[PDB]
Design a protein around this ligand. Structure first.
Ligand code: FMN
Ligand code: FMN
Ligand code: CA
Ligand code: CA
Ligand code: CA
Ligand code: CA
Lengths: 346, 346
C-alpha cells in the first residue's frame, strides 16, 4: 500500500541553484522509475519534501536520502500510511526553488514558512525525542492508546550537586551540568536507551525490559567517560570533581496520552520520585557508583562480573530486594567533603 | 521603537470568505490610522498574521485581537523587538485567502503550511508553557543567559498510586491520573504558578519567591476540588479514592539553556528528587495533606491559620526546619488500606 512522508532538512553546505536543479532532475528520473511522486522545495537553506508511493519504495528512497551528505537534521514532520490517492500524480519530483521566486503573493508566504520552520526547530530541542519516533511511524502521539510495559529504568545524579551551586557562579554551574547531561544522553542514546526527562540534576531514562546488558554497558561507559573527563580537564576546572551515582531498576511504565490540556507527556512511571531517591541513597550509603536490583541482574544475558552488596527497599512495598553492582576497576560523605575543598579554591 | 509579531490561530467558528474579506478590510482601515502594516493569511481554518509598527500600537492592537471571539488558540510564533525596517511598508493589512487560491505553485505550499502548522500544534502540547512566554517577550529560549532565582516549589502526588496501577486496567489508571493532572494544572496556572514537569504521579510547579500566598491558596483549592470530585463521581468510580499530598518548599532554581544537543530544558532545581521524596514522606508520616517549610510560611503575607507540626530535614544538609500546615476543616498508611479495598471491588 501507499505511504506519504513529509520532512524538512537543513543544507549541510551552501548549494547553488544549479545544484538544486540537478538534485530535482535526478530525483525526477529515479522516482519515475520507482513510480514515486512528490515535490521538493527549498528556501534559505531549508529543504521541504513530500514523497508518495509504495511503502516499500518510499522507505528505500528515504534511507538513501538520509545518507545524502548534502543535507542534515532530517526531521520527518508527518508519515501517512494507508494513503488512498496521490497528491502529486503528475510530478515524479517537482522542484520549487523559493529563493529564486519573486512572485507578489509568495513573498509573505516565504516569511511565514521561514518563521514556522525556525519556531519548529526551537520546539524540537525541548521535546522528548520519543514523540518524533511515534510521528515517523505514522501515528499521532495524542491518539495513542494507553499501554503498560516493563522497562529498565536508569537514574543518574551528580554527587554533591549543591556544593557546585553554592560555590560557583551560575554560568559555571550550568557549564558543569550541561557537560554531565551531554555525556549521559549521548551514551544512553548510543546504547539504545531513551532519556525521558531531567529531574533537577537527575537523568531519567528507559531501556527495553530485556535490554539490561545495554543499560549496564551504558552505565559503565558513563563512568569511564566521566573519569576521562575529570583527568583531562584544565587545571582548576570544576569538571575535575564531577562524579555521578547511577541506579537501575525495573518498572512498569505506562505509555499513552498523559496530562492535561496545558501540558502533555508520553509516559508515566508511578513513584519515580521515590525510586530515584532510594537509588541515590544507596549509591551514597554503599559508596558504589553503580547499583541495581536483582530484577535487572536477572534480566541480563552476558556474564557480567556481578557482586552482591546488600538488601534494600526500592518500591514503597516492604519487599526486601538484593542490590548488586559490577566488580571492576571502575566501581572499585567521602566525595562530598573533597568537592567543597576543591571548589573553594578554584 | 518598532515591533513585529507573528502569530497563528484557529477559527473559533466557520467563517465565510466574505467575513474574512471584511476582517481584512476593517483591519486595513484601522491599521492605516495607527501606522501599522502587515499581512493576514487564512488556510483551512487557520489564521496567520504578521503585524509591524510602534511597539505601543502593536501591543494595543494585539490585545484587541486576543479578545476577538472569531478565533482562538492564539500562539505567537515570533516577536521581534527593535525592528529596523518594515517588511510590508505598502500593506496596512493585506489579506490573502489561501482557500480560494488555485495557483499552480501555491498548491504544494498550502499542503506544506498545513502540515507545519499541524505538527506545530502537536509539539505545543508536549512543551513547557514557559518557553512560549519567553518567545512572546521577544527572546530565543536557546539564547537566554543563566540566572539563579528563588522560587516557591510545589510538589503534589497521588496517595497510594501503586494500588491503582495494580488493581485497574491501564485505561482507567490513565483516566485517573489525567483527572488529577488536569485539576492540579488548572488551579496552579490560575493562581499564577507554572507547572514545569510531571515526575511519575508527582506534579512539580513553581511560584515566584514572594508568591507564597498564591501557592498556599492553590494548594487549598486543589484539596477542595479533589474533595468535590471524590463526592460527586459515579458510584464505583476510582475517582472516589483519589487523594493527594502537597508539599511546598523554597528553592534556588537555575533558569537557562540546560541540557544537551538531544534534549533541552529551561530550568533546573538541583536535588528536586530528594526534596519531593522528603515532602511525600512528611505528608504520609503526619497524615497531613499539606505541609510546607518555615521559609514558605515566612514568605506569606496573609493571616493564614498556620499550625506548627514537627521538625524535618528537606535538603540533604543536616539543618532541622520547622514544618507547618494550615489548620482548617480540609487538612483536619490510613488511606492506603482503604484504597485497595475499594478498588478491589469496582
Ligand atoms: C533534499 C534531497 C531530496 C532528494 N530526493 C530524492 C528523491 O525524491 N528521489 C531520489 O531518487 N533521490 C533523491 N535525492 C538524492 C538521493 O539522496 C541520492 O543522492 C540519489 O537518489 C542518488 O542515489 P543512488 O545512490 O542510487 O545513485 C534527494 C537528495 C536530497 C539532498
Ligand atoms: C485574525 C484576525 C486578525 C485581525 N487583525 C486586525 C488588525 O490587524 N488590525 C485591527 O485593527 N483589527 C484586527 N482584527 C480585528 C480586531 O480583533 C477587532 O475586531 C477590530 O480591530 C475592531 O476593533 P474595535 O473594538 O476598536 O472596533 C483582527 C481580527 C482577527 C480575527
Ligand atoms: Ca543529586
Ligand atoms: Ca536478600
Ligand atoms: Ca506518589
Ligand atoms: Ca524546630
Amino acid at each position: 500500500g501507499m505511504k506519504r512522508l513529509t520532512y524538512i532538512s537543513k543544507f549541510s553546505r551552501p548549494l547553488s541553484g544549479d545544484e538544486i536543479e540537478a538534485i530535482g532532475r535526478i530525483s525526477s528520473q529515479k522516482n519515475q522509475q520507482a513510480n514515486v511522486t512528490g515535490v521538493l522545495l527549498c528556501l534559505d537553506g531549508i529543504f521541504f519534501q513530500i514523497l508518495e508511493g509504495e511503502a516499500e519504495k518510499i522507505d528505500r528512497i528515504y534511507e538513501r536520502i538520509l545518507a545524502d551528505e548534502r543535507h542534515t537534521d532530517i526531521l520527518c514532520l508527518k508519515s501517512e500510511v494507508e494513503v488512498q490517492e496521490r497528491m502529486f500524480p503528475d510530478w515524479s519530483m517537482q522542484t520549487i526553488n523559493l529563493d529564486e521566486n519573486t512572485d507578489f503573493l509568495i513573498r509573505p508566504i516565504k516569511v511565514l514558512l521561514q518563521t514556522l520552520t525556525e519556531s519548529h526547530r526551537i520546539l524540537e530541542k525541548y521535546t522528548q525525542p520519543s514523540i518524533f519516533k511515534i510521528i515517523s511511524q505514522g501515528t499521532n502521539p495524542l491518539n495513542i492508546r494507553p499501554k503498560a510495559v516493563e522497562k529498565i529504568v536508569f537514574f543518574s545524579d551528580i554527587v554533591s550537586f549543591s556544593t557546585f551551586a553554592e560555590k560557583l557562579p551560575v554560568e559555571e554551574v550550568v557549564s558543569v551540568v550541561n557537560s554531565y547531561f551531554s555525556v549521559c544522553t549521548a551514551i544512553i542514546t548510543r546504547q539504545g536507551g531513551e532519556v525521558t526527562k531531567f529531574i533537577g540534576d537527575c537523568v531519567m531514562a528507559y531501556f527495553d525490559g530485556d535490554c539490561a546488558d545495554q543499560a549496564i554497558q551504558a552505565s559503565l561507559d558513563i563512568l569511564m567517560e566521566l573519569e576521562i573527563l575529570r583527568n583531562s580537564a584544565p587545571e582548576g576546572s570544576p569538571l575535575r570533581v564531577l562524579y555521578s551515582g547511577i541506579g537501575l531498576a525495573k518498572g512498569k511504565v505506562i505509555e499513552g496520552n498523559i496530562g492535561s490540556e496545558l501540558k502533555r507527556d508520553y509516559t508515566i512511571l508511578g513513584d519515580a520520585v521515590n525510586v530515584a531517591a532510594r537509588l541515590e541513597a544507596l549509591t551514597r550509603q554503599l559508596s558504589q557508583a553503580l547499583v541495581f536490583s536483582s530484577e535487572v541482574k536477572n534480566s541480563a544475558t552476558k556474564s557480567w562480573n556481578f557482586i552482591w552488596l546488600t538488601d534494600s527497599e526500592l518500591k514503597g512495598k516492604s519487599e526486601s530486594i538484593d542490590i548488586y553492582s559490577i566488580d571492576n576497576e571502575m566501581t572499585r560523605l567521602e566525595i562530598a567533603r573533597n568537592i567543597g575543598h576543591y571548589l573553594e579554591r578554584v
